[PDB]
Amino acid sequence: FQFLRCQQCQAEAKCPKLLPCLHTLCSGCLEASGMQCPICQAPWPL
Amino acid sequence: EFQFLRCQQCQAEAKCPKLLPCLHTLCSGCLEASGMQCPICQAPWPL
Amino acid sequence: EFQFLRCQQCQAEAKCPKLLPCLHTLCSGCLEASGMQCPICQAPWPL
Amino acid sequence: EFQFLRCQQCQAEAKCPKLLPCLHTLCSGCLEASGMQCPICQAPWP
Ligand SMILES: [Zn+2]
Ligand SMILES: [Zn+2]
Ligand SMILES: [Zn+2]
Ligand SMILES: [Zn+2]
Ligand SMILES: [Zn+2]
Ligand SMILES: [Zn+2]
Ligand SMILES: [Zn+2]
Ligand SMILES: [Zn+2]
C-alpha cells in the first residue's frame, strides 16, 4: 500500500495531521499554510 | 437498502448535501442557517 | 450558489447519494447498476 | 497542536495511514491483521 495524497499539491502525505476542515495535507503544504487551510481557508486553532 | 448521509452539525439526515469548500456534510437547514462560513470548521463560503 | 456532489464512478451529478459501506459517492444510476458490490472498490453490499 | 487521524475500526491513533481502495482509515495494527480485505467494509485488497 501507498500513502495518502495531499489534496493541495498531490504529493504523498505520509503522516497527515487531523485538520478542522478534514483536508489531507503533506508536511510541506501544512508548514507553508500560515494560519488557515490553503484549500478552504478554515482557520487553524490555537 | 441504503440510507442517506448524516449532517455533521446536527446529526439529522442530510439527504442531498451541497459540495462545500471544506469536506463537511450539512443538512439544508444547517447550511441555510450558517451565514458566511461552515458552522463546524469556519471555512468561509466563496463570495 | 453551492453545487451538488459528483459521482465518483461516472463523474455525473450525484444529488442525493446514499451512504455506502465503503464511503464512496455514487449517483443513483451507478448504484442501481452496481449489482451486489461497489463498482469502484468492490466492497460487498450487505445481504 | 494538531493531533493525528483515528483508526475507523478501533479508534486508536492512525499516524501514517495507507491509501486503501475503499476510503477507510486504519492504524497499522488493524491493517496488518486484516488479511485480504478491509475489516470494515470487506473491499478486497489489490
Ligand atoms: Zn502538499
Ligand atoms: Zn481545508
Ligand atoms: Zn443539520
Ligand atoms: Zn467545514
Ligand atoms: Zn454515476
Ligand atoms: Zn466503494
Ligand atoms: Zn485500528
Ligand atoms: Zn473499507
Numbering used by the authors:
A (entry chain C): 52 to 97
B (entry chain B), C (entry chain A): 51 to 97
D (entry chain D): 51 to 96
Task: List sentences quoted exactly from the publication behind this structure.
We have determined the crystal structure of PML RING at a 1.6 Å resolution by single wavelength anomalous dispersion. Similar to previous RING structures, the folding of PML RING49–104 is coordinated by two Zn ions, but in contrast with previous studies, PML RING leads tetrameric complexes. Within a tetramer, each PML subunit adopts a balloon shape configuration with two distinct sub-domains. Sub-domain 1 (SD1FQF) is a loop containing only three residues, F52Q53F54, while sub-domain 2 (SD2), comprising residues 55–99, is a classic C3HC4 RING finger. Together with homo-dimerization of SD2, interactions between SD1FQF and SD2 create a four subunits torus-like structure. Within the current tetramer, the N-terminal F52Q53F54 SD1FQF undergoes a radical 23 Å swing away from the adjacent SD2, allowing the SD1FQF loop to engage with the hydrophobic pocket of the other subunit. This shift also exposes L73 and allows SD2 dimerization. As estimated by the AREAIMOL25 program, the buried surfaces between one set of SD1FQF/SD2 and SD2/SD2 dimers are 1333 and 779 Å2, respectively. As oligomerization proceeds, the buried surface of PML RING tetramer increases significantly to 4216 Å2, accounting for ~40% of the overall surface of PML RING tetramer.
